[PDB]
Amino acid sequence: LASELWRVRWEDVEPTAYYKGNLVAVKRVNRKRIELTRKVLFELKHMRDVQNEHLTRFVGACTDPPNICILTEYCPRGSLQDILENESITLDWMFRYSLTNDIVKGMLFLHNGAICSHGNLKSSNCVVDGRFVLKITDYGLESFRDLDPEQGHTVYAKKLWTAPELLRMASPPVRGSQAGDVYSFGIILQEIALRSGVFHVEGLDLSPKEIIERVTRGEQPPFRPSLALQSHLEELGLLMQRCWAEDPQERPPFQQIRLTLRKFNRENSSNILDNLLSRMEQYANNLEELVEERTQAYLEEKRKAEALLYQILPHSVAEQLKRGETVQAEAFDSVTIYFSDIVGFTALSAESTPMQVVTLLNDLYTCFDAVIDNFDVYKVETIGDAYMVVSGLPVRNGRLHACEVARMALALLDAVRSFRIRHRPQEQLRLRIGIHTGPVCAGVVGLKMPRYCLFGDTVNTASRMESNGEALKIHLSSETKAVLEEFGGFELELRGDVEMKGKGKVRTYWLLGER
Amino acid sequence: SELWRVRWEDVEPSSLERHLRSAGSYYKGNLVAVKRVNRKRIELTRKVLFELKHMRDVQNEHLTRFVGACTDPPNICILTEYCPRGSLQDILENESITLDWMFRYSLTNDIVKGMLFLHNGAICSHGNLKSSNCVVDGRFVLKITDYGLESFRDLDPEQGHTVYAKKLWTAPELLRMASPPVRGSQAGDVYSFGIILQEIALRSGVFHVEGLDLSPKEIIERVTRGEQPPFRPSLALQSHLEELGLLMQRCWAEDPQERPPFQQIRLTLRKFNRENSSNILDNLLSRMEQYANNLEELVEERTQAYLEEKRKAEALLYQILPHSVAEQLKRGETVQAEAFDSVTIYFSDIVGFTALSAESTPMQVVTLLNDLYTCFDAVIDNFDVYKVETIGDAYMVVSGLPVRNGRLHACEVARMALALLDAVRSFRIRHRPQEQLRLRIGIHTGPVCAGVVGLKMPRYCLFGDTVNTASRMESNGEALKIHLSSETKAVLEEFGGFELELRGDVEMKGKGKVRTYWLLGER
Ligand SMILES: Nc1ncnc2c1ncn2[C@@H]1O[C@H](COP(=O)(O)OP(=O)(O)OP(=O)(O)O)[C@@H](O)[C@H]1O
Ligand SMILES: Nc1ncnc2c1ncn2[C@@H]1O[C@H](COP(=O)(O)OP(=O)(O)OP(=O)(O)O)[C@@H](O)[C@H]1O
């Protein structure tokens, strides 16, 4: 009695955190009148002088102005609350019976021990050890009740977890009752069977205060959280319902519950640690399976991000730079450049609302992208109305580069003559189209966002030719006309070497169609 | 009959496949091993009967068990019990899985006990013991693979290079000797166990040379040839492994005389490796729990990495659009077309760029644009302005477009016209270091109207006469000089603090001759 070996007096505690080397967990208490009491001393001595395989152990207590708390061995894994809820990780049926048997074995010694059951043995105040040896906090020692009766409805519900029979709008003893322990065990079993929060029945929905008041008032039919049945067994549910019966006599005793649990677990009939070892091994396997799933998801996400990162590349450098390769600058001997511009667009957009002028430039992108993708061309840049077509830039096509860039304008000049402008349905848009061929030089440019620029003297000549071009006609240069005549099958027309800008007299031809 | 002839017809397929490397990237009783043989015939003599009897009588907690032999002459099978979670070599393969020193020592003592039990029996040595032929079980009960079935073996001369690659675990004495013992001697098994212990002690690969790192064939040939110092690896760099080194030095013994009596070696290890040891079987549970905790830590870190990658992909999805518009589009709301009373438009162009790039190598022309992009993208982030498009060597920047800023937009697109006209003079050209890149700048103010156009690839586009006016104004500028407009000039004069200078009444392709001014500096 005079040993005083239960108190550390806050003198030597490691700065829950560790304490005297051991990493115990401490729960605080809100009280100031706890000085000394012989009965409380005997209760604390009884609480310290107990140990069991399924029961936890008390470590230390502090009752000084610096700290009013009790510290016990810290459970490494999570509490039973989170695990039983599940949907994070799964569990086996034999695992369920192992946990239930451990809880029952602990409760049998707890209730029939130094004193009656602590009463506050909620399903959210018990956890498992490192080797999954279920323990419970579940002792108050007549001093853990930090006085605060005026908390509110949340405390009302978390109490309403308690047995219905004791909770009858009256003050129960702080120690508790055997019926409270029986109902706590029944509630824990129901939570394990249903795996959904605490005290959930089929129903539709239940507020904490509403359900608590309905239970306390007393319905003519017995208010019981009826759990959904299953094909494996139903005697466990019947025992759970009988334990929760309003009549205390109908509630079976701890010995009866233990006998029923043994009968249910008689299928296993294993009493050695081997069951625990197997359960731990299968739990580890389940964890590994979850790990595999999540790493697969991470790989998929990384792949998606990589695919997103290179949307502007011309589908060739994109597949090369992705596969750890490197792309150097290149110069191509002959490429075809095509320009498309809206003629007189600076006036149509003048007399139009911004909402009436943003649905037109967006309705022409969806009309040209359906035809600019059929052929083997590429759109390098697009700023407003002007376009950009380069043929053969990614992979050389030889002499074909001058054939696909000329059939694209003929299929786009007729596809724009039936385009409906919602701002004015009785009007036809005018577009100028120019084509040129010549050597070019290109390469991958950009670090934050990879673009693809074409750098050559032919671009300026093509721009000059396209600028000086009549509407509703395709203007081609002599270099393109050479390849056109070499291939054949298209009707080109001589226009005249008179109208030329930036040079002297240069012959440019008109594209009229291909048979 | 030996009651160990499993029929090919009875149960050939069961539990098709699950990837054994379940880490970072069967017949009516349990899962069984899937192997075969190229003999294509059965000629079991009395020796094969004795081997089958020895296999049937051999029942130990460590050594694996075999269901039976095959029946069909074409397809052979050795239905051995499959111990899960891969092999010890596989266990050390993934560096993500972390061996615990005590845990590794317990594993080594377990394999030592298995080796002693195997040696004491009729089979003097397995003859094929290796790091990859020792798999842990569901409770990490170690076994030895191919430690039996003396009737058949892969003794057919074939794949000499693959022999030098996959039979590297053999002892130097066995390798030097032309005739190899299929049922090897105890000394060879001891040397194989020593090599396995050396591999387990370190974290690197086989033979852990950290030297020339030559091919396995060359190393094996050198070891077979030998010298005064035998070709052999060191132990480790740990200063607290003196006993491990002392045991391993006797383990690399070259002659059978120096070969230790492996039972005595295991006793010495229990003296040294078993530091206070543990209980009969609690150690297994503790070491399994430690491994489970390790896996939990690994998966938590992996989930954190996945969340970071998801955030990165979300950022990468929308970046061309303005930050405010991108947030308003990712939230769920729809951006509508808006008209603004007064905005600032800025044009920048390299003067004579078509001539400097004419006489240049393609690499020397692609290394001059990327460097300029990295030289302007750092000074444009120190102001309050937006970039909407960048086509080649021309820049176009808007001010105040995303969020209305009142009379501040005209006071922000001009302050950046002075920090960019003084940061383009210290630029460096790779292929000509004695030249300065001339730039042309134009600024204008006007009532633009902009929207978020585009499907599946949206971009922010501004429309109105302001763009055309700005282009016309900037098409008649001068290099190394900032040219302003009357609309911007009024706001600049109203704000104060900028020393403007009159320019003249140069005509333009438009309304005609209008007032113009230069921006000299900011007081
Ligand atoms: N394995 C464990 N060992 C010791 N303490 C633990 C363990 N797991 C959780 N705890 C702690 O036990 C406490 C459980 O809740 P707490 O005792 O504070 O609530 P309570 O007021 O008794 O109410 P209720 O049981 O209704 O939730 C928490 O402080 C939690 O951190
Ligand atoms: N129980 C088992 N545990 C681990 N690996 C096994 C097992 N049974 C068969 N294997 C196979 O053995 C491989 C590793 O050993 P190894 O490559 O040496 O082949 P082996 O079939 O065991 O025999 P051998 O030494 O003749 O090649 C594994 O990749 C797997 O395919």
PDB file of N, CA and C in Angstrom, chain B residues 14 183 219 346 371 397 511 520:
ATOM      1  N   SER B  14      -4.283 -26.511 -62.695  1.00  0.00           N
ATOM      2  CA  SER B  14      -4.958 -25.985 -61.515  1.00  0.00           C
ATOM      3  C   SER B  14      -4.175 -24.785 -61.008  1.00  0.00           C
ATOM      4  N   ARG B 183      25.665 -35.672 -57.222  1.00  0.00           N
ATOM      5  CA  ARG B 183      25.503 -35.647 -55.770  1.00  0.00           C
ATOM      6  C   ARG B 183      26.811 -35.119 -55.198  1.00  0.00           C
ATOM      7  N   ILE B 219      34.812 -14.020 -64.975  1.00  0.00           N
ATOM      8  CA  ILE B 219      35.088 -14.202 -63.551  1.00  0.00           C
ATOM      9  C   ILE B 219      35.181 -15.684 -63.211  1.00  0.00           C
ATOM     10  N   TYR B 346       0.878  44.696 -76.543  1.00  0.00           N
ATOM     11  CA  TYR B 346       2.314  44.871 -76.715  1.00  0.00           C
ATOM     12  C   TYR B 346       2.819  43.889 -77.759  1.00  0.00           C
ATOM     13  N   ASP B 371      17.247  29.457 -76.221  1.00  0.00           N
ATOM     14  CA  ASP B 371      17.899  30.345 -75.267  1.00  0.00           C
ATOM     15  C   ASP B 371      17.165  31.669 -75.129  1.00  0.00           C
ATOM     16  N   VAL B 397       1.748  40.355 -76.131  1.00  0.00           N
ATOM     17  CA  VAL B 397       1.398  40.310 -74.716  1.00  0.00           C
ATOM     18  C   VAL B 397       0.227  41.249 -74.468  1.00  0.00           C
ATOM     19  N   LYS B 511      -5.880  55.481 -90.705  1.00  0.00           N
ATOM     20  CA  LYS B 511      -6.495  56.804 -90.628  1.00  0.00           C
ATOM     21  C   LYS B 511      -5.604  57.867 -91.262  1.00  0.00           C
ATOM     22  N   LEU B 520      11.335  57.203 -73.214  1.00  0.00           N
ATOM     23  CA  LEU B 520      12.760  57.259 -72.906  1.00  0.00           C
ATOM     24  C   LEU B 520      13.088  56.491 -71.630  1.00  0.00           C
TER      25      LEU B 520
END
